[PDB]
Amino acid sequence: QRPERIKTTPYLEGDVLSSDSGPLLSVFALQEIMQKVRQVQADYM
Amino acid sequence: QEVLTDFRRQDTIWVLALQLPVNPQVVWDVPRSSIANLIMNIATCLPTGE
Amino acid sequence: FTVPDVQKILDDIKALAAEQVYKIVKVPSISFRHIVMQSRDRVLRVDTYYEEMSQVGDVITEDEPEKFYSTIIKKVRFIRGKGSFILHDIPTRDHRGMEVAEPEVLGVEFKNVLPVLTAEHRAMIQNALDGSIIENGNVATRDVDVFIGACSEPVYRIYNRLQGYIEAVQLQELRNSIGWLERLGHRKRITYSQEVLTDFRRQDTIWVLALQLPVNPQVVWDVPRSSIANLIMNIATCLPTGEYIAPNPRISSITLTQRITTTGPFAILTGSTPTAQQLNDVRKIYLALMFPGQIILDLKIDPGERMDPAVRMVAGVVGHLLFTAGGRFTNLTQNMARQLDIALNDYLLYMYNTRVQVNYGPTGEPLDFQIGRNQYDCNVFRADFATGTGYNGWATIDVEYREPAPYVHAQRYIRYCGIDSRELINPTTYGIGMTYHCYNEMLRMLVAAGKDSEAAYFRSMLPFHMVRFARINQIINEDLHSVFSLPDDMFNALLPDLIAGAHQNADPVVLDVSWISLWFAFNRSFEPTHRNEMLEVAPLIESVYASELSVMKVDMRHLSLMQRRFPDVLIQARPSHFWKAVLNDSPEAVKAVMNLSHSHNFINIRDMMRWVMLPSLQPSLKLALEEEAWAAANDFEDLMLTDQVYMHRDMLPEPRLDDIERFRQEGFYYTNMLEAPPEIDRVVQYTYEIARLQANMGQFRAALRRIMDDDDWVRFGGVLRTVRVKFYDARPPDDVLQGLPFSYDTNERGGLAYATIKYATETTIFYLIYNVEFSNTPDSLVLINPTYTMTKVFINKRIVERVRVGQILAVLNRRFVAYKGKMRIMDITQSLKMGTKLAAPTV
Amino acid sequence: LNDYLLYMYNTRVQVNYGPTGEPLDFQIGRNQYDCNVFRADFATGTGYNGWATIDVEYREPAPYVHAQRYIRYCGIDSRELINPTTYGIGMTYHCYNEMLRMLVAAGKDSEAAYFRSMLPFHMVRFARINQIINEDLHSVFSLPDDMFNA
C-alpha cells in the first residue's frame, strides 16, 4: 500500500537471509555490553 | 476510518490523571540514564525488519 | 549454445507471433435492440453496447488507484476486442431487378414488433426494406460491395480504421516487404520463397498481413541501457557453431624443429597438449574477436598456477600477430598492451650476441632500441590505440560504407587485413600469396633479430592465418548483420569511450583468459560447418517485439495524463501504480526480455518517461487499433463512471386511466434519468469534512431533513461512482428506491461516543414499465399518499429512446463494405518464417 | 586503504612518496592523483560518507521539543524515493566520486565496474536508514540536540 515498497524492477529482489525485531536486538545489546564489561573485569585484577 | 465526535452523554463522568503533553527534560535529568533511554528506545521504536 | 531460458522465451515469442486477433463473420455484431410496450406504434430502442459494457468490471475507490487503472485497461481491451471483425460472405436476396440486403445484416433486431403492427406500418417497412440497395464498388482494382447498416460510433471508428489498414496493406506494403526481405536474402546468402503468392487463383484473392516487414530499428535501439541485452540475445539468435582444425604437423616439424640436437621455446611449446580450460579460453578469444569493441579481452593468473618464461615470450610475440586493437576500434585494454609489449621486449633480448649490435634507446620505456645492419627502429611497435601500431589493423582499411544496406542501423562492412568479404574462399588453396604491411614488417624485424626458425614457421602458416581471417570475415559480414548490432554512432564512440575514462555510453563487457591460450587459439581454426536454426525467423521476431514495445509506449503515453484529468480520485498515487498495472496486463516474454537487461542496472520513472517522448513507433495493426481505441475512449462518460448523482425526493406518476385504449396506444414509462443537471442554486456540494462536522455538532440528520424539506439537490462527494442499468415490469424493491446514498453509524465504547459517515460508491440507473389491464378502474393506481423516489442521475448520451414506427430505421447511416462470397482470404503472416540457408562450399 | 592502494598484481606504475611517515603521503599514476585527501580527521571529515556534504538539517517544528534535527546520509533525502531528481547514472555523491576516480586512477578497473554497478543499492539502503531515523525513532527518548551537538 505504501508506494516505496512496491517494485517493478528485478534488481532489488532476492532471498531473505534473516529477520529481526526490537526486543531481540535490545536484549542482545544488553548482553553484549554485559559480556564486554565482565570480560574486562575478569581478565585483570 | 472511524472518527471521534465529542458528544457528551447526560449521565457520564470523565476522570483523568495524566496530561498528555510531556516534558523531555524530566526524563533526561536522571543521573546515568542515557544507556537506559537508548536501550528502551531500541525496545520501543524499532519495527520488525529483515 | 544458448542457456535454455532465453530459448524458451524466444519460443514463446514465436508462439505469440502466430495468433490472430481479427475475426471473419457473416453478420456484424448486434448493436441495437427493441423492446415492445403495450404501445402498438412506439417501442423502446436501446443500444446494447451500453448495457453490455455496463455489466463488466468490479467497483472502485480512491483507496485502490492501481485497481482502477487495471479496470481501465480491461475496458479498453474490451472495446478493442469488440470490433475486430471483417465482414465476408454476406447474404442477400434479389428483387425488382436489384440485389437487396437482409434484415439480419442490418445489425438491428425488430423482429418482435411485426405482429402487433398494422397494414400501413407493414407496407411502409416493406417499402423501406425495398429501399436498401447495394453498390458494386472497387478497391485496388478489385470488386467489392457497399451497403447501409447500423453500428455504434466507438465500434464504427475501429472498424473504419481496420478497413483503412487492410486497404493500405493491399496497396503498397506487401511489395516493399517482399523487396526488403529479398534484398536481405541476397546479402545474407539466404533463399526465401514466394510460392504461396503464385497459385492459379492469385489474381482474385485478398491478402491479410498482421506484421509489417520494415521493423524501424530505432525502436529496438531506443531501449535504455539495453546494449548488453541486445548483445547477448544477438549471439543467442545468430551465432553459429563449427569445428576446430589443426594444420599439417610436418610444418611445425620442419620449421621449429629443423635441428634436433638443439631446441627453442617454440619447439617446446609445439609439443604441448590441450586441456578443457584452454579450449574454453580459445572459445572466449574467438567470441571476443567476432565482436570488436563490446567484448574486451583481459588476463588472469590463477593463484595455484605458475607461468613459464617460454610461455610468456611466445605469448607476446604471437599475440602481437593475432590481435587488431587500434586505429578506429579496439580489442584489448591498455593493460593487455603493456603485458604484450613487455613480453616482446623480453623475447627480443634472450639471445643477444656479438653478431647483432643493438643500439639501446636512452628512454626507460621498454622496447626502445635499434637492431639489425639497417638499424631498424623498433620504437614504432608501441601499442597505442591512437596510431594503432602493434596490431593487425595498423595501416589498414577496416570500416567502409559501400552500398545501401538492408538494415539502415547497420551500414558497416568490416574488412580485416585488406581481405574482402564478397569472395567465397577455397580454404585449401586461398591465402598462398597475399600480404600486408604489418606482417611483412614483423618478419623483417624477426630476420633483423636473427631468428630464422620463427620466420620460417610464420611464413609457412601465413595461409593458415589468412583462411582463419577469411572464415572470420565471412561469419561477421554474412550472418551477424541485424538490428541487434551496435549502432553506427555508438560504434564510432567506442574508442573515445575507452581512452577517455568515462561511461556515458554502455560499458563494454570484459572477458578474461590465460596466457598459453593464445598459442592454442593460433593453432586451432574455427569452421562454421553448421549454421544456427533460428536465422530465418529473425524478421518476424523483430516485427512482433517492436509491436509490443510500441503497445507499452502508447500505454505509458496516454496513461501519464490520468491524474490531471481526475485529481480527486487519483490523489495519493504515483506513476509506479500504472507502471505495475501494465506489467500486470502484458505477456511474460517481453517482461523477461527487459529482465535480462534492467536487472543489471537500475531504472527509474523518468527513464520510462523520456522513453515515451521518443517518437519511435512501429507500423502494425494492433498499434492502429489501440491508438484509435484510446482516442475513442477520451470521454469517461462512455465508461460508466459519473458524478452527476443527486439524492432528491420526487413523486412517481400514477396517472388516471380515463381511457384505456388511448393510454395503451401511447408508451408511457418512468425513469429517474435527468435530461440536464439543475441550477447551482439548488445544489450544495458536500465533502467528508462538512459531514464530519455536521455529525460532530449533533445536527446531522436534522439538517438533511430540513434541506429535503427545502426541496434541494445534494452532490455527495466528487468521487466518481460505478453505475448499472436495469429494466423492470413491476415496482422495484424498497432498497433501491428509498435507499440513501450514504451511511451513518454511531456507537459508544468506554464512555466515549464514536461515529463514522461514508458515501455510497455504487449506484444504478433503471427504467420502469407500466402495464395496464382492460378491466381496471381509471383510479386504480390512485393512492392517498404518493411514493417517494431518491436517486436522480444525469446522462448526456441518449441511451434509451421511445421511437415511433417510421423513425425506427432512422439509424441507417453507417456505411458497410463487404467482399464477394466468391472471393477468398488467406493469412500470409506466418509465411515469413520459411527460408533455407545456403551452406558455403568447404573442403 | 593505503596498503590496498599499494599492493598490486599487474605491471608496475610509478609512485612518488611524500615527506612524512603518515600513511597515504604519496602521489600515483599518470594523472598524479593525490591520495592525501583520503586521510581521516575528525574536525574536517574527509574520506567518508559524510565528507563534502551536509549531514544534519533543521526543518518545521517537530512534535518533540528536545530534538528538531533530520539526518541526511550522503546528501540524499527520502523524498528521492517518492519523487526522485536525477537519472540512474546521474545518482552520485562526492566521496563516492573521488573513490571511483582514485580506483580508475590506480589502474584498477574490474573493481570499479563492480562498485559502479553496486552504487544504487548502497544509496537506497541509506535512503531506508534515513526513513527509519527520521520517522520511526521520533520519541521523547531520542537524543536531544544540545548533547548531540556537544
Q: Over C21-47, what HEC string results? A: CCEEECCCCCCEEEEECCCCCEEEEEE
Q: How far is residue C745's CA from residue B3's CA, in Å, rounded to a whole number? A: 11
- CB atoms under 10 Å from CB of C397, counted, come to 12
Q: How far is residue C77's CA from residue C72's CA, in Å, rounded to a whole number? A: 9
Strands C42-47 and C32-36: antiparallel
Closest in B2, B12, B14 to C754, CB measured: B2
Q: How far is residue C306's CA from residue C369's CA, in Å, rounded to a whole number? A: 30
Rounded CA Rg of chain C: 40
Q: A17: distance to nearest CA of chain B, Å?
A: 7
Could A20 and B43 be called an inter-chain contact, meaning their C-beta atoms sit closer than 8 Å?
Answer: no
Looking up cell 464498388, which residue turns up?
Answer: C137
In order of C208, C295, D104, the CA distances from C703 in angstroms are: 66, 78, 75
Whether residue C632 contacts residue C154, with contact meaning beta carbons closer than 8 Å, is answered with yes
Q: What's the count of helices (H) and strands (E) in chain A, helices before strands? A: 1, 0
Contacts of C334 by beta carbon, 8 Å cutoff, 6+ apart: C385
Documented resolution in Å = 6.5
Q: Rounded to the nearest 5 degrees, what angle is found at the Cα of D146, between the Cα atoms of D145 and D147? A: 95
The chain C residue lying nearest B13, using CA atoms, is: C751
- The secondary structure element, H or E, covering residue D33 is strand D33-34
Q: Is A17 on the interface with C (CB under 8 A)?
A: no
C361 Ramachandran zone, left/alpha/beta (phi>0; psi -120 to 50): beta
Could B28 and D136 be called an inter-chain contact, meaning their C-beta atoms sit closer than 8 Å?
Answer: no
Residue type, C838: L
Q: How far is residue D40's CA from residue C840's CA, in Å, rounded to a whole number? A: 67
Taking contacts as CB-CB distances below 8 angstroms, the residues of chain D near C503 are 89, 116
Closest in A20, A23, A33 to B43, CB measured: A23
Could B5 and C751 be called an inter-chain contact, meaning their C-beta atoms sit closer than 8 Å?
Answer: no
Q: How far is residue C20's CA from residue C829's CA, in Å, rounded to a whole number? A: 10
In order of C4, C540, C833, the CA distances from C177 in angstroms are: 32, 12, 13
Could D81 and A12 be called an inter-chain contact, meaning their C-beta atoms sit closer than 8 Å?
Answer: no
Q: How far is residue C441's CA from residue C395's CA, in Å, rounded to a whole number? A: 12
- CB atoms under 10 Å from CB of C678, counted, come to 14
| Helices C538-559, C4-17: crossing angle, 10 deg rounding | 80
Whether residue C41 contacts residue C804, with contact meaning beta carbons closer than 8 Å, is answered with yes
Taking contacts as CB-CB distances below 8 angstroms, the residues of chain B near A23 are 43
What cell was used for A16? Answer: 531473505
In order of C61, C64, C622, C687, the CA distances from C718 in angstroms are: 12, 16, 35, 8
Closest in C503, C600, C606 to D87, CB measured: C606
Q: How far is residue C495's CA from residue C329's CA, in Å, rounded to a whole number? A: 6
Q: How far is residue C359's CA from residue C773's CA, in Å, rounded to a whole number? A: 128
Chain A adjacent subunits, 3+ CB pairs under 8 A: B, C, D
Looking up cell 586503504, which residue turns up?
Answer: D1
Q: Rounded to the nearest 5 degrees, what angle is found at the Cα of C330, between the Cα atoms of C326 and C336? A: 90
Q: How far is residue C534's CA from residue C237's CA, in Å, rounded to a whole number? A: 6
The chain A residue lying nearest D80, using CA atoms, is: A4
Whether residue C10 contacts residue C586, with contact meaning beta carbons closer than 8 Å, is answered with no
What cell was used for C531? Answer: 549454421
Looking up cell 510500441, which residue turns up?
Answer: C550
DSSP state of C332: B
Could A22 and B39 be called an inter-chain contact, meaning their C-beta atoms sit closer than 8 Å?
Answer: no
Residue type, C771: N
Q: A23: distance to nearest CA of chain B, Å?
A: 5
Whether residue D96 contacts residue D143, with contact meaning beta carbons closer than 8 Å, is answered with no
Q: How far is residue A18's CA from residue C831's CA, in Å, rounded to a whole number? A: 54
- C805 — phi, psi (to 5°)? -65, -50
In order of B46, B47, B48, C427, D69, the CA distances from D132 in angstroms are: 9, 9, 12, 69, 14
What cell was used for C474? Answer: 565471412
In order of A25, C97, C100, C244, the CA distances from C94 in angstroms are: 91, 7, 5, 76
Could B3 and C698 be called an inter-chain contact, meaning their C-beta atoms sit closer than 8 Å?
Answer: no
Cα dihedral D18, D19, D24, D28, rounded to 10, equals 0
What are the residues facing C513 on neighbouring strands?
C299
What cell was used for C752? Answer: 466515549
Whether residue C514 contacts residue C281, with contact meaning beta carbons closer than 8 Å, is answered with yes
Looking up cell 593468473, which residue turns up?
Answer: C301
- CB atoms under 10 Å from CB of C352, counted, come to 12
Q: How far is residue C46's CA from residue C732's CA, in Å, rounded to a whole number? A: 20
What cell was used for D74? Answer: 550522503
Identify the contact set of chain C against chain B, taking CB-CB distances under 8 A: 692, 695-696, 698, 746, 748, 751-757
Q: Is C573 on the interface with A (CB under 8 A)?
A: yes
3-state DSSP assignment of residue C671: strand
- The secondary structure element, H or E, covering residue C623 is helix C621-631
What cell was used for C371? Answer: 637492431
In chain A, residues preceding a discontinuity (C to N beyond 2.5 A) are: none
Q: How far is residue C403's CA from residue C762's CA, in Å, rounded to a whole number? A: 66
Q: How far is residue C411's CA from residue C405's CA, in Å, rounded to a whole number? A: 5
Q: Is B49 on the interface with A (CB under 8 A)?
A: yes
| Helices C334-347, C309-322: crossing angle, 10 deg rounding | 120
Residue type, C106: L
Taking contacts as CB-CB distances below 8 angstroms, the residues of chain D near A11 are 120
Closest in C696, C748, C751 to B14, CB measured: C751
What are the residues facing D15 on neighbouring strands?
D28
Could B48 and A21 be called an inter-chain contact, meaning their C-beta atoms sit closer than 8 Å?
Answer: yes
Taking contacts as CB-CB distances below 8 angstroms, the residues of chain B near D141 are 27, 37-38, 40-41, 44
In order of C35, C173, C310, D5, D80, the CA distances from C51 in angstroms are: 14, 39, 87, 75, 46
Q: How far is residue C67's CA from residue C59's CA, in Å, rounded to a whole number? A: 9
Residue type, C363: T
CB < 8 Å & 24+ apart, contacts of D99-104: D101/D33, D102/D5, D102/D33, D102/D35, D102/D38, D104/C501
Cα dihedral C324, C325, C329, C333, rounded to 10, equals 150
- C515 — phi, psi (to 5°)? -70, -50
In order of B17, C208, C537, the CA distances from C192 in angstroms are: 92, 19, 11
Nearest to C299 by CA among D59, A3, D94, D9: D9
DSSP state of D74: G
In order of C41, C235, C468, the CA distances from C241 in angstroms are: 80, 11, 15
Q: Is A22 on the interface with D (CB under 8 A)?
A: no
Q: A10: distance to nearest CA of chain D, Å?
A: 12
A36 CB burial (10 A radius; 0-12, 13-18, 19+): exposed
Q: Is A29 on the interface with B (CB under 8 A)?
A: yes
Q: How far is residue C550's CA from residue C680's CA, in Å, rounded to a whole number? A: 45
In order of C531, C822, D19, the CA distances from C199 in angstroms are: 32, 16, 91
What cell was used for C108? Answer: 438491428
Q: How far is residue C72's CA from residue C66's CA, in Å, rounded to a whole number? A: 10
Q: Over C272-324, what HEC string results? A: CCCCHHHHHHHHHHHHHHHCCCCEEEEECCCCCCCCCHHHHHHHHHHHHHHCC
The chain B residue lying nearest D138, using CA atoms, is: B45
Nearest to A29 by CA among B39, C740, C703, C465: B39
Q: Which residues of C783-817 are buried (b: 16+ CB within 10 A; e: fewer)?
A: eeeeeebbbbbbbeeebbeebebeebbebbebebb
Q: How far is residue D67's CA from residue D58's CA, in Å, rounded to a whole number? A: 10
Nearest to C745 by CA among B8, B9, B3: B3
Q: How far is residue C68's CA from residue C80's CA, in Å, rounded to a whole number? A: 18
How many Cα neighbours within 13 Å face the side chain of C106?
22
Q: How far is residue C531's CA from residue D141's CA, in Å, rounded to a whole number? A: 72
- Strands (E) across C687-798 are located at 713-716, 721-722, 725-728, 742-749, 752-759, 765-769, 788-794
Q: C280: distance to nearest CA of chain A, Å?
A: 30
Whether residue C506 contacts residue C274, with contact meaning beta carbons closer than 8 Å, is answered with no
3-state DSSP assignment of residue A22: helix
Whether residue C25 contacts residue C104, with contact meaning beta carbons closer than 8 Å, is answered with no
- The secondary structure element, H or E, covering residue C346 is helix C334-347
Nearest to C667 by CA among C234, C23, C45: C45
Q: How many residues does chain C have?
A: 843
Could B7 and C753 be called an inter-chain contact, meaning their C-beta atoms sit closer than 8 Å?
Answer: yes
DSSP state of D61: P
- CB atoms under 10 Å from CB of C174, counted, come to 16
In order of C484, C565, D1, D3, D30, the CA distances from D35 in angstroms are: 43, 55, 10, 12, 13
Q: How far is residue C48's CA from residue C41's CA, in Å, rounded to a whole number? A: 21
Nearest to C650 by CA among C789, C791, C792: C789
Strands C85-87 and C23-25: parallel
Nearest to C691 by CA among C704, C680, C681, C682: C704
Strands C752-759 and C742-749: antiparallel
DSSP state of C644: -
Q: Is A19 on the interface with B (CB under 8 A)?
A: yes
Whether residue C655 contacts residue C663, with contact meaning beta carbons closer than 8 Å, is answered with yes
3-state DSSP assignment of residue C815: strand
Q: How many residues does chain A have?
A: 45
How many Cα neighbours within 13 Å face the side chain of C153?
6
Chain B adjacent subunits, 3+ CB pairs under 8 A: A, C, D
Could A4 and D82 be called an inter-chain contact, meaning their C-beta atoms sit closer than 8 Å?
Answer: yes
Could C756 and B2 be called an inter-chain contact, meaning their C-beta atoms sit closer than 8 Å?
Answer: yes
Contacts of D122 by beta carbon, 8 Å cutoff, 6+ apart: none
Q: How far is residue C830's CA from residue D7's CA, in Å, rounded to a whole number? A: 61
- CB atoms under 10 Å from CB of C72, counted, come to 20
Q: How far is residue D105's CA from residue D33's CA, in Å, rounded to a whole number? A: 7
Q: How would DSSP label each residue in C113-169?
A: SSTT--HHHHHHHHHHHHH---EEEESSS-EEEEEEE---HHHHHHHHHHHHHHHHI
Q: How far is residue C839's CA from residue C530's CA, in Å, rounded to a whole number? A: 8
Strands C673-674 and C788-794: parallel
Nearest to D72 by CA among D119, D120, D127: D127
Nearest to C628 by CA among C177, C306, C155: C155
Closest in A3, A11, A12 to D82, CB measured: A3
- The secondary structure element, H or E, covering residue C650 is strand C645-651
Nearest to C513 by CA among C313, C314, C297, C315: C297
Contacts of D2 by beta carbon, 8 Å cutoff, 6+ apart: D23, D24, D35
In chain C, residues preceding a discontinuity (C to N beyond 2.5 A) are: none
3-state DSSP assignment of residue B10: coil
Residue type, C385: F
Q: B41: distance to nearest CA of chain D, Å?
A: 6
What cell was used for C687? Answer: 465533502
Nearest to C289 by CA among C43, C58, C539, C525: C525
CB < 8 Å & 24+ apart, contacts of D57-66: D62/D138, D63/D138, D64/B24, D64/D138, D64/D139, D64/D140, D64/D142, D65/B24, D66/B24, D66/B25, D66/B28, D66/D140, D66/D142, D66/D144, D66/D145
In order of C465, C641, C681, C683, C715, the CA distances from C678 in angstroms are: 90, 19, 8, 8, 11
Whether residue C177 contacts residue C169, with contact meaning beta carbons closer than 8 Å, is answered with no
| Maximal CA-CA distance, chain B | 51
